[PDB]
Design a binder for this molecule. Structure first.
Ligand SMILES: *Cc1c(COP(=O)(O)O)cnc(C)c1O
Ligand SMILES: *Cc1c(COP(=O)(O)O)cnc(C)c1O
Lengths: 828, 828, 60
């Protein structure tokens, strides 16, 4: 009753008040004292001091939307890669200063506690950091969004290099809790699995089903310094704990021991695809899961939150596409369409046609691949076993769509078998991308070139039938995470001259273009990067060692360690560089520290191998007494978002070298721009729009473009060919297989040899020379320490297109329909 | 650091602050608001407002101990039937009136809230209540006592009577958590199973073990206003979790699903004793589990808290007993004795005889078996496989104990094969009770005749080698749960009169003796009890339903449903009574409400059947219009501590009707005296010492005493001889078998007629008459309200022998060697 | 002379091990299918324990 209210509960900004709230939590929540507490307790102590402050806002923020009924847009994804949370909550919440002070007074080093937190083993690749860039921008722009994905116990693995080879341990990030989550067993929901469909008078029943319980953990995610805080809703699988007797099925036998290990084990570990080992009923089990749970919430909350009031069409969902917006990341939530159709046709009774009008006005799908054999597809043998009613709902969807197609092109019967959701073959499957296009009103590519590719090759019949459903939205980066916390200095001078305004529409960063020439800009920013690198060459010594140099050119590549990313390009050129500098030692050469981070994909052998070669490379060069301090090669173990927040600022040269048109977008790309790095790269994916902003002058675009790559396909790329012109290349395939870079196991990199000389799909030897040589244009510029630094501001001013802020206001305005407020919301 | 302190985080006792905490927790902790909260969220919130008060003290107490270094007593038992914690945590802390005001003003009903808490499914009987009453009285006379047990996730069922038949639903008490516990990931231990004993040169080695990990959770136990709060540590079982790689034995097979199933379910479920269905390895596995984990937490705390300062003799376990006390409640924690031997001889490195002296001075057994064949015994085939290092030490201990018997009884070669701890027969068994007598420096029975017979019959040869070990300690009860909080009514008046002093020692209630004849008191006492019976009829007619006339005499029996608890005797006298009212209707008959309650024990049949007997019996008399409201029968469903707390204060007669020489003591008994009720009952165990305190003249002792049992046994028993003497026994036997209580199934109760007629081990019929004579004396009294109550007074003022505070101050001085202080520790 | 695998058939008690779990079903199916199936070489799907299990068996 109203004495119970939010109006009082924290004094905020006093150190003071903060030190009392560290004093309560440490003693009363953690129930540890001053004498037996430990650093991990004291970070847990502080997390609660700030979370106090988050949920304050959260509650307000949330009840804001009950009485103000706004459109609620859900960002449905099965990977969400949030990383560290304490610093971020401080900047968005301003408390950082206070927080510091308070723990400095309380006699505790705040940074020493900040690396006691670990990343949310929750996501994994780029597409994760992507919904974690969008989450923060969504809130910021006043937008009512909840993000639903799964909560993973084990995230996805941890990388330890062992004797060269990638060794994977496991992330139980939650071990000792995670303070920012609030689990919720009151809102548990039963997800059905397997079953049987009886069609009777009023509808079909999907009877006899095993069930997995799904129950929700909420994390709040704040806006930037306007006091909105949003709901990340995570699911967790639970085997219904009804074992000794329930259904009086067991007496003699437990297979239930396995229900309670194959139900539960849905949210255990993340599998990320475009790999995995075999399209396991477990991945489809997770994708069905996340969607059944998530949709129940969506309807609980359309009918509830004053829509028992705002009814007015038998709670008919005509109000639904007006109020709800489901945003389908990749094909992985695609079951959201058949399921929304199940719920609606079966469970309420909205005749198929209304609830399909409703479905496509609610749904929208974001494409992330460039290549068509890699679009997800699932076999009718699996959807029939497992999700049978759904299979039926897909066949009868496709009935009708392919009629839509039959009215449209009488007699093109081959397009009728080019549009279908069932791809007849060796084995008959459903193409899950073609489902999304048919139940979403708006499909977008994720970068410029990339949607032109969806429109005129890949989805080109679809675009011909319904042109009006395709769009573009170039992915962004969030300036908070990727400017303010990951480089504080670099945001000080920017506001020191240009002055904050920008961190919520990054385009003002361009003003600092008009500020190039100043002879201080140029020596200051150099100091900053020269601040940052020292710090990294400490990391590269103290907690993971080597003998780096600060003074050096900082050659960074942190990608997925797949083939098509050319990590090997990088290695031919390092050994290039090491061979010359072995021939004429006494020779001035703008030297570098080469750094390659990534994880491989367990079981992808080539990628396991490449890392070994990149480490091995390292024992050899980095311990040779004639290279001295000239080349350095560092494999970056356990690359991840919080290692990314530090590697990106020491880095000079952002290597973005993937074979032309393989990458469909590119996000590491954008952070690498905003913190001042020079970006050598093919015209691919994202370096395209970066180049058309920063201007071609300022980049290191090179290599065989798409045109050329598709022409070396009509011509049969013969590799041994370059082998024979280039004496170096001869000489570096040479040393590898000879046994140079591995005298205890010479033969070893024979694999890679035979990949490169003979079966190289991605055309390494073809882009060699024009790359070796393009590098000599950057090794040009980093002798002349002034001009290097001149390029750099000119890259940096340009960057405000690479704002999640942007990427979001567009989604917001053009699909979601909602207009992105920048309003600071009230609140205690 | 030092600014980081407890000192004054609570505004403590201000509605002004407490409301504001039921407001931080409902919002910041729970993370709900005024809008979205359920009752539960508020009982949850209140729970946390109290809990702060609670842990401040707990912190102060435990650091208090660190500084002073007193003897620590550790209480191992396998059950703690705590019951509810809110209202008991508030009276031991005084908060009831501040927490009421406070919730009342935010407009929340404090008692509604209290019915949200579920009883800890951690106990299951008279043995688990004993342990949590000693635990209250251990905090109250300030003893540094930890309690140690298993933290069962699912209790041991909730009885729910479906169709007359008991149906057992799981009790996941923790379903929505439990707020009082703070789990400790930090100090998780291994519990090594199976494996192999290697004999190296310095000693044994237990190798190749399978390992479960025991992880602690602690609850706090507030003392009554003396400001101490001690620890209670429950061990949750936890399978090691690196399932996808370890030892690189997987890839191929998971039978390891069963580790994480059979390690995990060591804590899901209780297995309660002298029964069960078959002496399973799980039983014994729970048992070794709580010990292995605990003697590590016990030697940890011993090595840590100031013992190399307190070393003196190489921290020697010479000085271990000054600082440790180990209470093996029943044989279940017996393995405590080869394990403390195992660690000190194998791990540490004393010799046997040194570890032996230190073992027997540290453990003390307590016994609850009045009779012999229930006495715990494990098969050595069953200990070899699982516990091989420990089998060896029990063989060496048996060997060495026997040498002492021969030294003492030269040539008594049959005493040797009695005093042995290894039994031979059908299968070779180890008798775990003789194993406790050899590792305890004391053995104690829990009643005078109980503790007498342990000495004269049960363990007689042992008594003869070792007088200084056997002793008696009669069970007691706390006046806090069981007077102050179950019935505050009778608690006010006893202080307007003799005034609070008494709660900290019950003997002052004798001061009320002189008040037999004040006529205020006498009608106050009675008004008090009526106010309870009336309260109690509100439950019976509300949250369950019937027509219990509030004014009638309340007959209650709430013991375990068993053959030897005679709830049959009771039903025969009830259907008798039925018959007589029906017989001679318009008569004066002194009317009753017979309420019988108890949980059967699944896989026992006479017990499951008797429950249907009392439910049907009722269903008749409880609708028969010629009876009106002269009789009711009610089966109290799902008997637990918070139904006890409700029935004991309302009850008028307690039924303690055992067959003489079957009970050892009985704590319920005692709870019935203090709540101002009368007692018909046979002269068993506790009733002996209960009666000599109040004088025989105020109990209703009826029936065969022990001596008379042995007489009907030597001379030979024959129920049809009683049957032939008593025409009223034909009267209901007839009635039972004819089908008068079983409309759809006559012959159904033939199992009981038949048994009663030829297989009543307990002589129901032999006690039929003195019982139904003694009960005609009982109804007498209820017609004379003045004297009924004068009987009530010489009972309430005489209870003093029966406080757990008595029991415990004796345990402390004769066995444990600590002097119970009553000093208030000052604390916030 | 050709060989067929056969697990020891004492399956309810023998080793004084069971009355508890039967995992033990699996020797009588992972010994049993040592001779129930060719696993033909320079292929197969993964150098399973079962083929090494079979080479030793015909040899021993
Ligand atoms: C942003 C980010 C990247 C993104 O990957 P790209 O393919 O380079 O766009 C990589 N790793 C982490 C952890 C990130 O935060
Ligand atoms: C104390 C108590 C008992 C004790 O059983 P008795 O045989 O009467 O000693 C039983 N159940 C509960 C819940 C108790 O509080």
């Amino acid at each position: 009753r109203k004495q119970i209210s939010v109006r009082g509960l924290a004094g905020v900004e006093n150190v003071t008040e903060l030190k009392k709230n560290f004093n309560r939590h440490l003693h009363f929540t953690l129930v540890k004292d001053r004498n037996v507490a430990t650093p991990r307790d004291y970070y847990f102590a502080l997390a609660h001091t700030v979370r106090d402050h988050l949920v304050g806002r959260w509650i307000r923020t949330q009840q804001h939307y009950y009485e103000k009924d706004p459109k609620r847009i859900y960002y449905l994804s099965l990977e969400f890669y949030m990383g560290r949370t304490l610093q971020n909550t401080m900047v968005n919440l301003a408390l950082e200063n206070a927080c510091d002070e308070a723990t400095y007074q309380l006699g505790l080093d705040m940074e020493e506690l900040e690396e006691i937190e670990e990343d949310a083993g929750l996501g994994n690749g780029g597409l994760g950091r992507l919904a974690a860039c969008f989450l923060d921008s969504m809130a910021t722009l006043g937008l009512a969004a909840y993000g639903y994905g799964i909560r993973y116990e084990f995230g996805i693995f941890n990388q330890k290099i062992c004797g060269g080879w990638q060794m994977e341990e496991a992330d139980d990030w939650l071990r000792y809790g995670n303070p920012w989550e609030k689990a919720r067993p009151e809102f548990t929901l039963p997800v059905h699995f397997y079953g049987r469909v009886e069609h009777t008078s009023q509808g079909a029943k999907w009877v006899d089903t095993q069930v997995v319980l799904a129950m929700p953990y909420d994390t709040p995610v704040p806006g930037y310094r306007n006091n909105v805080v949003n709901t990340m809703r995570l699911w967790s699988a639970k085997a219904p704990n009804d074992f000794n007797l329930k259904d009086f099925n067991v007496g003699g036998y437990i297979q239930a021991v396995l229900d309670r290990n194959l139900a539960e084990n849905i949210s255990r570990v993340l599998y990320p695809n475009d790999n995995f080992f075999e399209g396991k009923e477990l991945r489809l089990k997770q994708e069905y899961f996340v969607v059944a749970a998530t949709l129940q919430d969506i309807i609980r909350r359309f009918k509830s939150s004053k829509f028992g009031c705002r009814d007015p069409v038998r709670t008919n969902f005509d109000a639904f596409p007006d109020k709800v917006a489901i945003q389908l990341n990749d094909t992985h939530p695609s079951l959201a369409i058949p399921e929304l159709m199940r719920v609606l046709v079966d469970l309420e009774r909205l005749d198929w046609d209304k609830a399909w009008e409703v479905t496509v006005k609610t749904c929208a799908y974001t494409n992330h691949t460039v290549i068509p054999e890699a679009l997800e597809r699932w076999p009718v043998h699996l959807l029939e076993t497992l999700l049978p009613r759904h299979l039926q709902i897909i066949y009868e969807i496709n009935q009708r769509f392919l009629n839509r197609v039959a009215a449209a092109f009488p007699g093109d019967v081959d397009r009728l078998r080019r549009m279908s959701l069932v791809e007849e073959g060796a084995v008959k499957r459903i193409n899950m991308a073609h489902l999304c296009i048919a139940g979403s009103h708006a499909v977008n590519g994720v970068a410029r070139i990339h949607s032109e590719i969806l429109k005129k090759t890949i989805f080109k019949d679809f675009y011909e039938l319904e042109p009006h459903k395709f769009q573009n939205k170039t992915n962004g980066i969030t300036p908070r995470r990727w400017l303010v916390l990951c480089n504080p200095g670099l945001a000080e001078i920017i506001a020191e001259r240009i002055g904050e305004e920008y961190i919520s529409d990054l385009d003002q960063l361009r003003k600092l273009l008009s500020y190039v020439d100043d002879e201080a800009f140029i020596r200051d920013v150099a100091k900053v990067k020269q601040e940052n690198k020292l710090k990294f060459a400490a990391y590269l010594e103290r907690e993971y060692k080597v003998h780096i140099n600060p003074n050096s050119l900082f050659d960074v590549q942190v990608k997925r360690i797949h083939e098509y990313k050319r990590q090997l390009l990088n290695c031919l050129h390092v050994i290039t560089l090491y061979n010359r500098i072995k021939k004429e030692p006494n020779k001035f050469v703008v030297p570098r520290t080469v750094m390659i981070g990534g994880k491989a994909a367990p079981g992808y052998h080539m990628a396991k191998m490449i890392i070994k070669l990149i480490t091995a490379i390292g024992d050899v060069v980095n311990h040779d007494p004639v290279v001295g301090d000239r080349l350095r090669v560092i494999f970056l173990e356990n690359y991840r978002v919080s290692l990314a927040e530090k590697v990106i600022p020491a880095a000079d040269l952002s290597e973005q070298i993937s074979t032309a048109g393989t990458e469909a977008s590119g996000t590491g790309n954008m952070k690498f721009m905003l913190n001042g790095a020079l970006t050598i790269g093919t015209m691919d994916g994202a370096n395209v729009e970066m180049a058309e902003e920063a201007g071609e002058e300022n980049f290191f675009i090179f290599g065989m473009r798409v045109e050329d790559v598709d022409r070396l396909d009509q011509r049969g790329y013969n590799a041994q060919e370059y082998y024979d012109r280039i004496p170096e290349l001869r000489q570096i395939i040479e040393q590898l297989s000879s046994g140079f870079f591995s005298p205890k196991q010479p033969d070893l990199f024979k694999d890679i040899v035979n990949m490169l000389m003979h079966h190289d799909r991605f055309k390494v030897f073809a882009d060699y020379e024009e790359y070796v040589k393009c590098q000599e244009r950057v090794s040009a510029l980093y002798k002349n320490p002034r001009e290097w630094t001149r390029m750099v501001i000119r890259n940096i001013a340009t960057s405000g297109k690479f704002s999640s802020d942007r990427t979001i206001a567009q989604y917001a305005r053009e699909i979601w329909g909602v207009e992105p407020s920048r309003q600071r919301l009230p609140a205690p």
